[PDB]
């Protein structure tokens, strides 16, 4: 649902911006 | 009547700010003083429960709410009788004298309609349709036809009923077909696209909405910013990018509509990113479109996940047509998503035969399957050709 798509999008942003 | 149904709808679901419920309560308290909202005011506890729906001092006694203004009291009970005497008891005595004196014809029919509109605000729909049905026989031209259709049109927006409304609106419009101007026809046209969101007609909703003007505001029936979100979100999902360039992204009114308010986030954030093929910032626009548009709106909250899930499937089709192959490392990383997130979305799309694509594991190359000269005669001609022959054999095999 919306909880699955929103969670995976925010968790990847923290890792991508740190690379 | 729609101003209360729009603000009080935020009371149903608020996942972020509590002040959104108190701010929307200020608009509700102001309107209930001028007009009696008792049918919808009582419908508040009959719509959504386990939030504010348990608080009543009359029919059912429980206290759980974030809003204490929705419970009956001695003040609203006395005001309910005051509005019932002035709009019904005082007006019907004057109309009763006009019936015996035989004053006018359409004036008495219009007086019954204005009186019938008051029964809708008292909470009695039996006498509202009874006085409306008696004035329906007196309707001939478009003078009394607009007022009759206006009462039934309120039943859809105010009572949120999609069943008995459209059936009555179509019967009144089909009886005598004139339409007056194009704005009086919008009442049948706008509600048509709105009703398509209840039964999930998808592209059928935007047929009359895209051609509709962006300045249309019905006030009590609908607001300016509410109808702006219906035509922007549904029209973007219907017309493909071929029709978006000559209609949506370039329009005299639509370019003027996006600058009026920032609550759209459809024809600007989603359209430009789709036209420029920028997938880096396109993903967070879907979250803002879901939270700040789909959720607060009434009919746009029914689908929920059916927006983002379907819109993400079609935006990949625009990329697959512009390249034969792609890069899995660029799609699953550089665009702002992860590897497991990309396989979850494309996991359900492939077996449904909604698109033709080639996904690579070891090589990590996303390849597009292009039918070339096959087009629509490859799998569609056999499926639709023989599929309709199965429907032809239904009545021919069993006879009667």
């Amino acid at each position: 649902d919306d909880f699955t798509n929103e969670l995976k999008a925010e968790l990847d942003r923290y890792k991508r911006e740190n690379q | 009547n729609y101003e209360v149904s729009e603000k009080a709808f935020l009371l149903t679901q608020s996942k972020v700010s509590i002040e959104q419920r108190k701010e929307a309560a200020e608009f509700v308290l102001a309107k209930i003083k001028e007009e009696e909202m008792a049918p919808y005011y009582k419908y508040l506890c009959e719509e959504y429960l386990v939030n504010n729906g348990q608080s009543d001092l009359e029919h059912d006694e429980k206290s759980d709410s974030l809003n204490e203004w929705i419970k009956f009291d001695q003040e609203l009970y006395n005001e309910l009788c005051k509005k019932n005497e002035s709009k019904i008891k005082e007006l019907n005595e004057k109309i009763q004298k006009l019936e015996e004196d035989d004053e006018g014809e359409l004036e008495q029919a219009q007086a019954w309609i204005n009186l019938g509109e008051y029964y809708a605000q008292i909470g009695d729909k039996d006498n509202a349709e009874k006085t409306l049905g008696k004035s329906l026989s007196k309707a001939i031209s478009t003078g009394a036809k607009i007022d009759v259709m206006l009462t039934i049109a309120r039943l859809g927006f105010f009572y949120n009923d999609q069943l008995y409304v459209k059936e009555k609106l179509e019967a009144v419009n089909s009886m005598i077909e004139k339409g007056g101007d194009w704005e009086r026809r919008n009442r049948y046209k706008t509600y048509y696209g709105i009703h398509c969101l209840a039964v999930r007609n998808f592209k059928e909703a935007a047929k009359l909405l895209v051609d509709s003007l962006a300045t249309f505001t019905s006030i009590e029936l609908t607001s300016y910013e509410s109808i702006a979100t219906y035509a922007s979100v549904t029209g973007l999902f219907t017309l493909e990018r071929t029709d978006l360039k000559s209609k949506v992204i370039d329009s005299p009114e639509l370019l003027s509509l996006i600058s009026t308010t920032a609550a759209l986030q459809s024809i600007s954030s989603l359209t430009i990113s789709l036209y420029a093929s920028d997938y880096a910032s396109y993903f967070p626009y879907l979250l803002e479109t879901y939270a700040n548009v789909l959720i607060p709106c009434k009919y746009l909250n029914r689908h929920a996940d059916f927006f983002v899930r379907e819109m993400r499937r079609k935006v990949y089709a625009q990329l697959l047509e512009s390249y034969k192959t792609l890069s899995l490392k660029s799609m699953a990383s550089a665009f702002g998503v992860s590897v497991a997130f990309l396989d979850n979305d494309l996991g359900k799309f492939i077996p449904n035969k909604q698109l033709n694509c080639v996904i690579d594991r070891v090589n990590g190359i996303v390849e597009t399957n292009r039918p070339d000269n096959k087009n629509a005669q490859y799998h569609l001609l056999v499926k639709q050709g023989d599929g309709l022959l199965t429907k032809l054999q239904k009545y021919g095999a069993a006879v009667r």
């Binding site: - | 420029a276 093929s277 512009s322 390249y323």
Partner: protein, 54 residues
């Protein structure tokens, strides 16, 4: 600095690009993208982005 001049900048950007791409597309296709970027003189992602949009 001028908003109207910037609006016509992308028009002139695609005008000179369409004339340069027409010289590439007119002969036979299936040539390396890196060789295409050397003739245009821009980034590979920029050449692939503007060409795929057209």
């Amino acid at each position: 600095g001028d908003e109207l001049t910037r609006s016509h900048f992308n028009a002139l950007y695609d005008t000179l690009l369409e004339s340069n791409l027409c010289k590439i597309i007119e002969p036979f296709e299936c040539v390396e993208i890196s060789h295409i970027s050397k003739i245009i003189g821009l980034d590979t992602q920029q050449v692939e982005g503007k060409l795929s949009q057209m």
